[PDB]
Design a protein around this ligand. Structure first.
Ligand SMILES: Cc1cc2nc3c(=O)[nH]c(=O)nc-3n(C[C@H](O)[C@H](O)[C@H](O)COP(=O)(O)O)c2cc1C
Length: 147
């Protein structure tokens, strides 16, 4: 079908992760449009995608702070056309720090009550994803059998 990926990556782990998801999708005979996020503007941004994939790294340590590029999107996730949209979420973190991938936890909270349809619990990556490469591949594959 037609899937979307918006991601926020500060050092690249979340980016690696997404392109891994994206090559696996496309390879599944999809249509995928992958974006960095910084170049996305809320304004009906999900509107025409079959599947939408949000994904978010986490910083702050003492509090949960969304990856810099992600905040504005997040703040306008209302203007996206989230309602009734098919969505899944994925992000990178460290089991260390208290709030282990809160950004993830937040983003979910808010499109489910935005009316979005969480098709699968999301990917919470501990450490280097290159080290959890097949685990994305498993998930990516899991989002595929949900819809
Ligand atoms: C100062 C600092 C704070 C961090 N806080 C968290 C955190 O609260 N939760 C988490 O899962 N990871 C935390 N991390 C680890 C990052 O999430 C990790 O670098 C992540 O894999 C980066 O993904 P990215 O390169 O797409 O931004 C923190 C890292 C630093 C340097």
């Amino acid at each position: 079908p037609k899937a979307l990926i918006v991601y926020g990556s500060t050092t690249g782990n979340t980016e690696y992760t997404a392109e891994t998801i994206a090559r696996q999708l496309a390879n599944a005979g999809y249509e995928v449009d992958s974006r960095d996020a910084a170049s996305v503007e809320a304004g009906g941004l999900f509107e025409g995608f079959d599947l939408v994939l949000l994904g978010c790294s986490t910083w702050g340590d003492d509090s949960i702070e969304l990856q810099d590029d992600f905040i504005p999107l997040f703040d306008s996730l209302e203007e996206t056309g989230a309602q009734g949209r098919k969505v899944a979420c994925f992000g990178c973190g460290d089991s260390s720090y208290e709030y282990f991938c809160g950004a993830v936890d937040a983003i979910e909270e808010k499109l489910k009550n935005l009316g979005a349809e969480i098709v699968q619990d999301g990917l919470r990556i501990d450490g280097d994803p290159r080290a959890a490469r097949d685990d994305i591949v498993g998930w990516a594959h899991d989002v595929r059998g949900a819809i």
